[PDB]
Structure 1
Amino acid sequence: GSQAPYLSPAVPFSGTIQGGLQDGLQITVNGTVLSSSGTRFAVNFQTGFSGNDIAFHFNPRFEDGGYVVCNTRQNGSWGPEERKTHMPFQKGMPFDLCFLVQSSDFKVMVNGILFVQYFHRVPFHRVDTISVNGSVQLSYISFQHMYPHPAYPMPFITTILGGLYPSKSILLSGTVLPSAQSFHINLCSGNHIAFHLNPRFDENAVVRNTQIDNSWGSEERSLPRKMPFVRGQSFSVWILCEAHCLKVAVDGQHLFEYYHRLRNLPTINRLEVGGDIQLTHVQT
């Protein structure tokens, strides 16, 4: 069983990794590097919340042409720095950063490409905390016990085992096709669509509705700001189920609430994704 994800955690952030790091554990970080608020950010796998002991410090730096520093801190002492002289991140752009823990190292992938392989210097069992600081904003941090990035056929239909309930979250990472017209995300119950999320680029709107016995209800189109999705750009979306409504955020920014119309939450046990996007991650 994998622990629940951290949704839109505020930076600086520090959170427990339930059960500590384990061989086969994959930690996914979806966020966006700030456009004009600093020149570096870091993701740390550490022991406790002090910072004196960081088993793995992943530090992208938008300095001197861009590079990334990897190191370990033990009892306040930094070890030999391991640097990658190329920068896979971009200011103002969302990213998919995944850490795969293995017996001898951390496999670090950025937007689907293996970027760094960091051999353990400190026993990975001693890591019980993940922290994030710097010029970055977070959408979510998820956990999954293990392909790190499998191919998702479109449309993608999958079962939400156990269905919905208060505190249940659904996560999605993908990319809007450059030529995208629209795409949708449905949470279904039998022959009904409990929740329909439909971003439309041509209409420049994000439509939400419910379909009962093939009949659509009142459309909800409210948005706190401009269209959050961009053509050709990667994105992340999380849907949090509460007793009275669903809360939806895109790239870490709350977009809206959608009060339940179909109330038997456990029956909402199917997720369907279709349209003009490519999927990267899905957690149900």
Structure 2
Amino acid sequence: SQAPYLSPAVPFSGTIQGGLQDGLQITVNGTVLSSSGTRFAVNFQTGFSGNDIAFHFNPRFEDGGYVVCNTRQNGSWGPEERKTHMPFQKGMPFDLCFLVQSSDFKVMVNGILFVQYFHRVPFHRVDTISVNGSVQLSYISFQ
């Protein structure tokens, strides 16, 4: 059991001890800022560069509110999967939970399953979580 990151500053990048494993649950607890921009992202990536992001989870308070899910490989973005629902709210606290499964990530927001994202690259290669944009973080916890 890895220790939680408590009140990490954004932008944040942090090691996932042992990498993503089938059954690992990562919790991101925080607050979407009220008036500090219109997007944030949680990135599950290989190392610290961010050129290789297995899963980019990117809520955008733009064009009615939607969430982009995508993968970056060797610096190139793939085809976006957009969920045209926004489960977050500017100025409001959230609990965001990611469950790593064999074929996909399951993402719950505030106790409710929000989206799944099927793996495009091997998940075992992911050892870093990064968070950027319009968000303040209280904690990131593991397992």
> What is the TM-score when the length of structure 2 is the normalising length?
0.99
Cα RMSD of the aligned pairs, angstroms, is 0.4
Per-residue deviation, residues 22-41 of structure 1 (Å, max 9, x unmatched):
00000000000000000000
Runs (5+) with no aligned partner, structure 1: 145-284
CA distance in 1 between counterparts of 2:107 and 2:121 reads 17
How many residues in Structure 1 have an aligned counterpart in Structure 2? 143
Per-residue deviation, residues 114-149 of structure 1 (Å, max 9, x unmatched):
1110001010011000000000000000001xxxxx
- Please tell me whether Structure 1 or Structure 2 has the larger radius of gyration of its CA atoms: 1
CA distance in 1 between counterparts of 2:32 and 2:26 reads 18
> What is the TM-score when the length of structure 1 is the normalising length?
0.50
CA distance in 1 between counterparts of 2:77 and 2:119 reads 14
Higher RCO (C-alpha under 8 Å, 6+ residues apart): 2
CA distance in 2 between counterparts of 1:58 and 1:112 reads 17
Per-residue deviation, residues 54-94 of structure 1 (Å, max 9, x unmatched):
00000000000000000000001111100000100000000
CA distance in 1 between counterparts of 2:27 and 2:130 reads 13
CA distance in 1 between counterparts of 2:121 and 2:33 reads 31
Match of 1:57 in 2: 56
CA distance in 1 between counterparts of 2:86 and 2:23 reads 26
Per-residue deviation, residues 149-192 of structure 1 (Å, max 9, x unmatched):
xxxxxxxxxxxxxxxxxxxxxxxxxxxxxxxxxxxxxxxxxxxx
CA distance in 2 between counterparts of 1:94 and 1:49 reads 27
CA distance in 1 between counterparts of 2:36 and 2:137 reads 14
CA drift of 1:53 comes to 0.3
Secondary structure at 1:11's aligned position in 2?
coil
Percent pairwise identity: 100
CA drift of 1:20 comes to 0.1
Per-residue deviation, residues 171-229 of structure 1 (Å, max 9, x unmatched):
xxxxxxxxxxxxxxxxxxxxxxxxxxxxxxxxxxxxxxxxxxxxxxxxxxxxxxxxxxx
Match of 2:95 in 1: 96
CA drift of 1:108 comes to 0.3
CA distance in 1 between counterparts of 2:46 and 2:86 reads 27
CA distance in 1 between counterparts of 2:99 and 2:141 reads 12
CA distance in 2 between counterparts of 1:22 and 1:116 reads 19
Secondary structure at 1:57's aligned position in 2?
strand
CA drift of 1:19 comes to 0.1
Secondary structure at 2:124's aligned position in 1?
helix
Runs (5+) with no aligned partner, structure 2: none
Match of 2:23 in 1: 24
CA distance in 1 between counterparts of 2:115 and 2:24 reads 16
CA distance in 2 between counterparts of 1:101 and 1:68 reads 19
CA distance in 2 between counterparts of 1:125 and 1:113 reads 26
